[PDB]
Amino acid sequence: KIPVVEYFGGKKPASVSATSVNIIDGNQVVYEIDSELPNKQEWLDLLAGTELNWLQAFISTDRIVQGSKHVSNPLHDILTPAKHSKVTIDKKTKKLTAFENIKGDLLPVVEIELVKPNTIQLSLIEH
Amino acid sequence: RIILAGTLDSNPIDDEYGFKHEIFQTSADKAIKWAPDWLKELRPTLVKNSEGKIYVKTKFSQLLGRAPLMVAGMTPTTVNTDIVSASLNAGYHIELAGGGYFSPVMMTRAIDDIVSRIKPGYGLGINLIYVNPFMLQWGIPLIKDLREKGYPIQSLTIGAGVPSIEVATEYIEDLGLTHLGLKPGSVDAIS
Amino acid sequence: THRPFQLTHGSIEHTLLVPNDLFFNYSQLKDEFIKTLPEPTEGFAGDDEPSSPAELYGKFIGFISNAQFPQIVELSLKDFESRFLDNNNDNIHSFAVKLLDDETYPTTIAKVKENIVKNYYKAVKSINKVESNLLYHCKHDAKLVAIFGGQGNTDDYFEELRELYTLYQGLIEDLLVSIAEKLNQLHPS
Amino acid sequence: THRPFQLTHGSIEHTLLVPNDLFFNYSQLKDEFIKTLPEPTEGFAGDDEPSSPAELYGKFIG
């Protein structure tokens, strides 16, 4: 009967229903930002979701471990809301992909995936 | 929530008990003032992580990401790096006491040893004495420098007194800590 | 064919649309108002001096409640509900505490009571069933219970009865009369 | 059942008849108006400060 969670700690996962997210369902749920931007913390909480998983950890936690040093999470600054930006999150694999406008075309710039059972790959794409 | 149906007046400063207006209040949102139930709001529950380890779910345990048991900073006992590193490696919050340190160089050397000996990602708490101005004067800059350098100083504890609001907010905003520990000794310090 | 009818007390000023035919009644009632009104003072600190247009119009309603113009009192009450209670989303008590909290028109609890609640319940003749927020939550999640006190709470307990009589004559007159008759019957024993 | 609704900026003053039901909407919009309106000045020399009732009501519309 003990509740089972992936990890225990940090801020409790939050359910955020905000504007400028334009959530649409599918194989990868897509959040799209219009001209007006949402709150940064609300946007990050929405991307993290209500389920304690690896992506919830990798977005929600405000620190990462570089060797033996606690450094600020760069994912907050990377995923900060942007005008005309899209973000697709897979329901099953929990893979995140951030799309931004380049030369008038929507192209991916951030991929976050689980390559191995305990390794998270964050890939910054330059076109 | 107690509502005094016998008297009509503006709600108290703390909003602790209602007045006659609350019984007749009508609004589109239909919101009403509630009161907290400490038991159901603060039951010490249990949570199991994916690795099977079981923790006592609580506010403190959530904040620390660890069990709700800590070792408070002791000037003879927790000054030494061995006990601090051992407690952190065992997985319980502990405070390195600055009572047995007198220079930023000595304190930084001790923190370096602790960081090198603990597991990656394990924070460190630091305990300072408010009655001692010298230790704070050379320690607060040290904590700020170590934090902006990226050290795992997870928290700072102030014992033998509580700082004022203006010093406290400086500690919160400048040092970049996860949480600030304070040790009141009386209801005035609790206030 | 309405007309603008204005009541003022110092900086206080409330204007309402009133029927042209009944404007004469409104004017005479206004004159009797400003006769009974204490002289305006800076800050409106006078106990009977209104501190807001809502207070002034409530006092107008309270005055006209006793007159040969029940249609005047009814339409004035309707206008007060429309402007101030905002077509009845908030009760008069909620409006009273909202004014006591409002800083633009500073007032006292006694001023708010006498100038709004007493007059509103003097002029209102029928109260429609309303489901409060508390009673709404009672049906789903709130558990409402009642406690009645005893003696020793206050050394001038009768003052509360006088306040209740003054504020709510039209609501408890029958109960008070019946109880007083029973007490008159019993106490000679 | 209309009602008198007035907007002012110093000596500026424009009153309009409005439905009583929507008077609440007009009042809140007026409050937001006088929040966004600078402090009145003699001569109404402020660049966005209206100088006539027509200017004030046009700004209300805007």
Whether B115 contacts chain A with CB within 8 A: yes
- Residues B104 and B146: beta-carbon distance below 8 Å: no
CA distance C83 to chain D (A): 8
- Residues C8 and C16: beta-carbon distance below 8 Å: no
Residue of B nearest to C117 (CA): B8
Among B181, B180, B124, which Cα is nearest to B153's? B124
Write the burial class of residue B55 (CB in 10 Å: 0-12 exposed, 13-18 middle, 19+ buried).
Answer: buried
Tell me the sheet residues that pair with C17.
C4
Backbone phi and psi for residue C129, each to the nearest 5 degrees, phi listed first: -60, 130
Q: Name the one residue in this structure whose structure tokens are 């009977």.
A: C48
- Residues A84 and A33: beta-carbon distance below 8 Å: yes
Helix (H, G, I), strand (E, B) or coil at C136: helix
Among B160, B158, B150, which Cα is nearest to B186's? B160
For residues C68 and B72, give the distance between their C-alpha atoms in angstroms, rounded to a whole number. Answer: 80
Residues of C60-92 as b/e, b for ≥16 C-beta within 10 angstroms?
bbbbbbeeebeebbebbbebbbbbbbeeeebbb
Which residues have CB under 8 Å from B106's CB, separation 6+? Answer: none
Whether D19 contacts chain C with CB within 8 A: no
* C94–B26 C-beta distance less than 8 A: yes
Contacts of D1 in chain C (CB under 8 A): 17
Whether C98 contacts chain D with CB within 8 A: no
Which residues have CB under 8 Å from B66's CB, separation 6+? Answer: A9, B55, B91, B92, B93
Helix (H, G, I), strand (E, B) or coil at C162: helix
Tell me the sheet residues that pair with B158.
B128, B182
For residues C96 and C85, give the distance between their C-alpha atoms in angstroms, rounded to a whole number. Answer: 10
For residues B71 and B84, give the distance between their C-alpha atoms in angstroms, rounded to a whole number. Answer: 9
Whether D27 contacts chain C with CB within 8 A: no
Q: Where are any strands of DSSP class E within D1-62?
A: 2-9, 12-19
Residues of D5-18 as b/e, b for ≥16 C-beta within 10 angstroms?
bebebeebebeeee
Write the burial class of residue B23 (CB in 10 Å: 0-12 exposed, 13-18 middle, 19+ buried).
Answer: middle
* Bridging pattern class, strands A105-116 and A63-66: unpaired
Among A114, A109, A85, A80, which Cα is nearest to A97's? A109
For residues B33 and B27, give the distance between their C-alpha atoms in angstroms, rounded to a whole number. Answer: 13
| Residue B176 Rama label (left phi>0; alpha psi -120 to 50; beta) | left
- Residues C29 and C63: beta-carbon distance below 8 Å: yes
Residues of C32-57 as b/e, b for ≥16 C-beta within 10 angstroms?
ebeeebeeeeeebebeebbbbbbbbb
Structure token digits, residue B40: 């159901």
Domain spans, chain A: 28-127
For residues A53 and A68, give the distance between their C-alpha atoms in angstroms, rounded to a whole number. Answer: 23
* A69–B61 C-beta distance less than 8 A: no
Whether C2 contacts chain D with CB within 8 A: yes
Q: Where are any strands of DSSP class E within B54-107?
A: 54-57, 70-71, 93-97
Residue A75 identity (one-letter amino acid)? L
Backbone phi and psi for residue B88, each to the nearest 5 degrees, phi listed first: -65, -45
DSSP A12: P
- Residues B27 and C89: beta-carbon distance below 8 Å: yes
For residues C81 and C78, give the distance between their C-alpha atoms in angstroms, rounded to a whole number. Answer: 5
Backbone phi and psi for residue C13, each to the nearest 5 degrees, phi listed first: -160, 115
Among D24, C159, A62, which Cα is nearest to B7's? C159
Tell me the sheet residues that pair with A101.
A106
Alpha carbon B147 to its chain's center: 17
Structural domain span for residue C45:
3-131
Helix (H, G, I), strand (E, B) or coil at B163: coil
For residues A108 and A101, give the distance between their C-alpha atoms in angstroms, rounded to a whole number. Answer: 9
Among C12, C96, C25, C3, which Cα is nearest to C56's? C12
Helix (H, G, I), strand (E, B) or coil at B152: coil
* C83–D20 C-beta distance less than 8 A: yes
DSSP C116: I
* C136–B11 C-beta distance less than 8 A: no
* Distance (Å) of CA C24 to CA A114, B135, C30, C96, C153: 83, 83, 10, 31, 51
Backbone phi and psi for residue A122, each to the nearest 5 degrees, phi listed first: -110, 115
CATH code assigned to A28-127 = 3.30.1120.100
Tell me the sheet residues that pair with C19.
C2
* Resolution of this deposited model, Å: 2.7
Q: Name the one residue in this structure whose structure tokens are 């694999």.
A: A93
- Residues C79 and C122: beta-carbon distance below 8 Å: no
For residues B128 and D53, give the distance between their C-alpha atoms in angstroms, rounded to a whole number. Answer: 66
